[PDB]
């Protein structure tokens with residue numbers, strides 16, 4: 001493929017500035033499964049010499065479905081940390097369900113699925129809609145500001161707090177820990193320590209279990225989460241369901257500002273198709289990886305036992321063989337078989353309906369209170385090699 005020597009699709013220096021859209025398009029055309037070599041000390045915490053870049057939607061789905069072959073536990077699923085991270089700090093992530101394999105993952109998922117019943121999520125609709133409306137009214141009344149802080153940030157956090165029934169007076173400390181919990185190497189956040197925030201949030205959650213959906217997870221059906229598993233579950237919601245939904249809201253609004261005919265259509269009919277096109281477009285998790293437990297032949301390439309494969313959701317969601325005109329933002333897109341919530345399989349996002357509900361509620365509120373919003377200056381991207389984040393974006397709410 002026509003790529004620079006040494007190019008690495010997980011390099012945080014690229015994502016601080018842009019998504020490498022042209023370079024993914026070139027792999028899909030010229031080398032859809034391609035070995036991305038990494039030199040010593042430049043592998044983002046891994047020392048194995050590189051990984052297979054997976055760029056096509058069917059391959060991402062095949063890997064996700066074959067979790068008997070493609071492990072989440074062996075190396076975790078995050079494909080890039082700071083280059084000098086200790087291997088013990090990657091391995092400690094194995095205590096969240098995202099980084100486990102069957103049978104351990106199968107037991108936790110079954111218990112945690114108590115939290116994500118359709119009924120549990122739907123119960124949160126009326127409070128999240130009242131919060132959404134108020135957030136948008138507050139932003140309109142401020143006139144201009146940072147849309148990430150004023151519109152995107154609070155409602156995903158209040159969704160987790162309402163799911164967990166956290167008392168009001170404890171939400172400010174909960175939200176502070178949760179916004180320090182996912183790792184990045186951005187200079188704006190160089191003074192955060194996700195390790196203290198993780199310890200502190202696990203201790204808060206364990207005290208909450210001891211005092212008792214929390215009661216349904218920690219009450220024996222004799223199966224239940226232990227008190228420490230409930231802590232690890234609250235840590236996992238902080239990393240899985242906070243910045244991801246926040247970034248789907250910012251990048252959905254960036255797409256509406258760049259495609260004004262789609263925002264006019266959305267304001268009229270608020271279509272059911274919009275939330276999934278916002279997630280496809282935003283692809284807030286750019287990639288997650290697996291490790292092969294045995295040799296496996298994937299679309300003609302011989303993947304070998306122990307090698308990593310990195311699923312680039314950001315490429316697969318723009319796969320020209322699967323989406324008609326994938327570079328067109330189309331809020332009526334149908335069909336829409338995107339992998340923004342992962343490939344279907346054992347670890348498919350358990351929060352997907354809660355995220356869709358959060359997205360729908362906030363965009364309805366923005367349409368109702370700020371229909372003529374316009375950007376003031378360019379979004380500031382986050383320096384991460386796997387999370388596609390926007391730190392700040394200045395907009396004029398009144399237009």
Ligand code: HEM
Nearest residue numbers: 097098240241244245248341342343347348349350351355
């Ligand atoms: C637009 C917002 C979101 C995006 C893009 C997203 C994306 C993902 C992805 C890509 C995965 C891994 C799937 C796989 O490997 O096949 C995942 C898993 C997971 N997500 Fe989400 N997510 C979002 C929102 C949420 C929310 C709101 C919650 C919860 C409050 C949540 C909870 C989880 C959990 C617990 C897992 C682990 C499932 C397991 O390992 O069995 N997510 N998510």
